[PDB]
C-alpha cells in the first residue's frame, strides 16, 4: 500500500492528500480508486495499467484536459467521476472502448461543448452528471440532447448558459429542435 | 395563459418572475411546469388540481420546508426537481403516492437527514440527485445507503458531510456496516 494511501478489500484511498502524482507501488488488483480532492491537472497515464479497475474517482482536482488516451484499455470501467475540475475542451474519442461505463460525471467544470460522438462507446451508460457547466446550447448539442431525453440519463440539473433564447433553459426537457446554428 | 407565464402546447414556463404565489389562470392541462428561479418558499396545495401535470420544476426557490401533505393527489407525476432550495430533512411520508416517479432532485438543498421509509413508493425510481447536500451518514440513513446500493440509481456526487471519518466518503460506494450509532 502507497505511504500516502489506505489499502482495504481492492479499495484504494489516497483522498485530500496534496497530491499531483499517482502515488507508486498501487496494488495490481485495485478496483476502487479514489483520488478526490488532489491538485492533479491532468489524468494519470498509468491508470490504464490497472486491470481491475471499475471505479475512478478523480473528484475536486485542477484537470484543465483529457487526452484520447486518458481511459483507453479500460473496457471493464464502471463509474467515472470527474466532478469539480477545469475541463472546457472534450476530445471526440475521450470515451472510447468504455463499453462497461454506467455513470459519469462532469458536473462542475467549465465545459460548453460536448462533441458529436463522444459517447459513441458509451452503450451503457444510464446516468451522466453534467450540471454547474456552461453549456452552448446550439446544433453541436442537439445529439447530447436527445440522448439524454431517452430513459432520464441526466437529473434535469443541467442548463444552457445561452446563446441568447437557450438561456437557463434545461439539457433535460427542452426540445431538440431548438438546439440550432 | 398566465400573464406571468408562457404556454405552448400544455408546457406553461414561468422562470425567473419574481413569483411568491402560483399565478392564476394555469389552464387546466398543463402536463410541464416550470417555476425555476422564484422566491417560492413551499409547494402550493393548489398544484394537485391539475390532473395532466406530470414535470414541476421548482429549482432555484426559497422552500425550506415540505409537508407530508406536499404532493398529496398527484399520482401522475414523472419529474420532480427541486434543486437549489433550502430543505433541511424529508418527512417521511412526503413522497408517497408517487408510484410513477421517475427523476427527483433534491441537489444542492440542506438535507442532512433523510428517514427511513420516504423512498417506500418511488417503485419506478431510476435517477436520483442528492449531491451537494451535508448528509449525516448514521444510522438513521444506513437504509439510503443501501437503496443507493441495491440499483444503479445515483451517478456518484452525492457525500457524506460527517459525523467524523464520514466526512467526504460517497453515499454510493461507502459500506452500509460503516453508517452507524
Not at 458509451?122 to 445529439?143: E, K, R, T
Request: glycine fraction near 6%; proline fraction near 6%.
Amino acid at each position: 500500500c502507497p505511504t500516502e494511501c489506505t489499502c482495504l478489500d481492492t479499495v484504494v484511498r489516497c483522498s485530500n492528500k496534496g497530491l499531483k502524482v499517482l502515488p507508486k507501488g498501487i496494488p495490481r488488483d485495485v478496483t476502487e480508486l479514489y483520488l478526490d480532492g488532489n491538485q492533479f491537472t491532468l489524468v494519470p497515464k498509468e491508470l490504464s495499467n490497472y486491470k481491475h479497475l471499475t471505479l475512478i474517482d478523480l473528484s475536486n482536482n485542477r484537470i484543465s484536459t483529457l487526452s484520447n488516451q486518458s481511459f483507453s484499455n479500460m473496457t471493464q470501467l464502471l463509474t467515472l467521476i470527474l466532478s469539480y475540475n477545469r475541463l472546457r475542451c472534450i476530445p471526440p474519442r475521450t470515451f472510447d472502448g468504455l463499453k462497461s461505463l454506467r455513470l459519469l460525471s462532469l458536473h462542475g467544470n467549465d465545459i460548453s461543448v460536448v462533441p458529436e460522438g463522444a459517447f459513441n462507446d458509451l452503450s451503457a451508460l444510464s446516468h451522466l452528471a453534467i450540471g454547474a457547466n456552461p453549456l452552448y446550447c446550439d446544433c453541436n448539442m442537439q445529439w447530447l440532447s436527445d440522448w439524454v431525453k431517452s430513459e432520464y440519463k441526466e437529473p434535469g440539473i443541467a442548463r444552457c448558459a445561452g446563446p441568447g433564447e437557450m438561456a437557463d433553459k434545461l439539457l433535460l426537457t427542452t426540445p431538440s429542435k431548438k438546439f440550432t446554428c
